[PDB]
Ligand binder design. Structure first.
Ligand SMILES: C[C@H](OP(=O)(O)O[C@@H]1[C@@H](O)[C@H](O)[C@@H](CO)O[C@H]1O)C(O)O
Ligand code: NA
Length: 492
């Protein structure tokens, strides 16, 4: 009869379906279905196992870089939003506007819009199907930005009429799946958009059902309640793979798990204790015990997806228990227990990783205690000391995420109080405008050195993202924190 409905058991849900505000480990797998971008990354180009870097036309049928500051897009014609309104350059201009995204006025609507954006100038609408995106200063990052999760295309009139909050609860996009319902902290339901411009949706419906406990998620797959489950650990591989009708599907993703600090707190204003905690983390033993060797430990804030700004000659991050003990003493730390906030196992292995780290920190003379918090119940900033986090490396360049998250205009310095050395912020400003070359390459290596010296966050590893699925549900994971169903979902 009708197509099969897809049932997903997920680790968590975003609090909003507004595509920029949905940026997280849990939002993109949903908003990738509701929306489209001008340029799309094709993870399966030339038979790649879901990790190809190839950029292909999407809402823009073609594009041309004009100069060091601008890129002109030719829009695909007769593309319709879910409410029937035709996609125009007006919708694109609005998506990348000062008003909605990067200007001072957008900070209330999209709190991280300005900090995550390029140094944009107002878009230029040439005609109904022609729009130029430009920057005030040189930027060779326009293309990678436009293909990213910052750039899902929103409908101007409908978005303006509802406002960013109401739009977030009733999204309208051009994507293969349209909005049905959103029960905050419970479920999101989408249905097939059969008016879709690209590959027709193969599922009649998609339900993202929150299953916070991974053991309950695994039981749900074994019982036949879910078709695909997310955010498992390599420790679940043996059991699931013992069921002949189920299997695990995993891949290393372009993201790093970390722990970070509220540097507005007295104990973390200075770098000494941040550094002591960083120097005591035995990453290889965590990777062996919890990840069955599947996770990858980077040589600093440095990843292969950065391409020309990836440094393959970089030394491993320091591990020095004896130096850590000496820093604990010099910091003046008195033995008072320091809290570490985690949203249960929102991050695969969050609590087992923390338990191991608590033990490593006991050995250097620092008492760390776990504090759990329910989905969407993140405690006030001044109630937090240490906390876990992750960063999706969302550009084919080193700019992201060191500059958008840890730069002078970023939330780590502004909200979380990192007093970054003046040199670090000078380098951030330089890498933003410089073209690729020796000067830019060396500036990112100096920024990586300062990042390790300062420890505003401590990089753990790139997780091996593990899903489990029914063998009769054909779907391949991609090397990013999202799920792709276009030409990548079939049943039987
Ligand atoms: C607690 C959640 O954070 P999560 O680690 O899931 O997502 C990060 C995101 O915060 C960050 O802006 C981007 C780019 O650095 O990477 C995402 O992985 C929050 O965003 O809902
Ligand atoms: Na499809």
């Amino acid at each position: 009869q009708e197509r099969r409905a897809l049932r997903l058991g997920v680790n968590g849900l975003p609090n909003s379906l507004e595509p920029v505000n949905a940026i997280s480990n849990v939002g993109p797998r949903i908003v990738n279905q509701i929306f489209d971008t001008l340029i799309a990354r094709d993870f399966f180009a030339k038979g790649a196992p879901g990790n190809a870097i190839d950029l292909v036309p999407a809402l823009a049928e073609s594009w041309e870089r004009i100069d060091e500051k601008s890129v002109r897009f030719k829009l695909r014609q007769k593309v319709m939003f879910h409410d029937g309104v035709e996609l125009t350059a007006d919708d694109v201009a609005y998506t990348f506007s000062s008003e909605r995204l990067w200007g001072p006025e957008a900070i209330k609507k999209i709190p991280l819009g300005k900090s995550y954006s390029l140094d944009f100038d107002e878009p230029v609408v040439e005609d109904k199907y022609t729009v130029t995106l430009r920057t005030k200063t040189p930027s060779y990052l326009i293309e990678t930005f436009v293909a990213s999760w910052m750039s899902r295309i929103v409908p101007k009139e409908y978005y303006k009429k509802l406002g960013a909050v109401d739009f977030g609860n009733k999204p309208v996009g051009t994507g293969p799946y349209k909005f049905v319902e959103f029960v905050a902290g419970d479920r999101v339901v989408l249905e097939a958009n059969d008016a879709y411009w690209g590959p027709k949706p193969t599922a009649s419906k998609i339900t993202y059902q929150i299953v916070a406990e991974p053991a309950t998620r695994v039981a749900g797959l074994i019982s036949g309640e879910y078709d695909i489950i997310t955010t498992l650990t390599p420790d679940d591989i043996q059991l699931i793979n013992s069921y002949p009708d189920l299997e695990t599907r995993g891949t290393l993703i372009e993201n790093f798990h970390m722990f970070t600090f509220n540097m507005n707190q007295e104990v973390f204003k200075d770098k000494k204790l941040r550094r002591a905690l960083a120097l005591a983390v035995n990453r290889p033993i965590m990777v062996e015990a919890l990840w069955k060797k599947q996770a990858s430990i980077p040589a600093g804030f440095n990843f292969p997806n950065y391409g020309e700004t990836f440094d393959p000659k970089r030394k491993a991050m320091e591990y020095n228990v004896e130096e850590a003990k000496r820093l604990v003493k010099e910091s003046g730390y008195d033995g008072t227990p320091i809290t570490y906030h985690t949203m249960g196992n929102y991050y695969a292995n969050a609590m087992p990783a923390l338990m191991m780290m608590i033990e490593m920190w006991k050995q250097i003379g620092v008492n760390v205690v776990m504090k759990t918090y329910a989905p969407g119940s993140f405690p006030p900033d001044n109630q937090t000391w240490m906390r876990n986090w992750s960063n999706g490396q969302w550009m084919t360049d080193a700019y992201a995420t060191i500059v958008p998250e840890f730069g002078p205009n970023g939330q780590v310095q502004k909200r979380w109080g990192w007093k970054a050395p003046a040199e670090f912020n000078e380098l951030c400003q330089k890498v933003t405008v410089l073209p690729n070359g020796k000067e830019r390459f060396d500036a990112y290596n100096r920024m990586r050195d300062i990042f390790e010296e300062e420890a505003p966050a401590v990089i753990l590893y790139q997780p091996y993202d593990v899903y489990a699925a029914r063998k009769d549900v054909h779907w391949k994971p991609v090397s990013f924190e999202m799920m792709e169903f276009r030409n990548n979902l079939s049943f039987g």
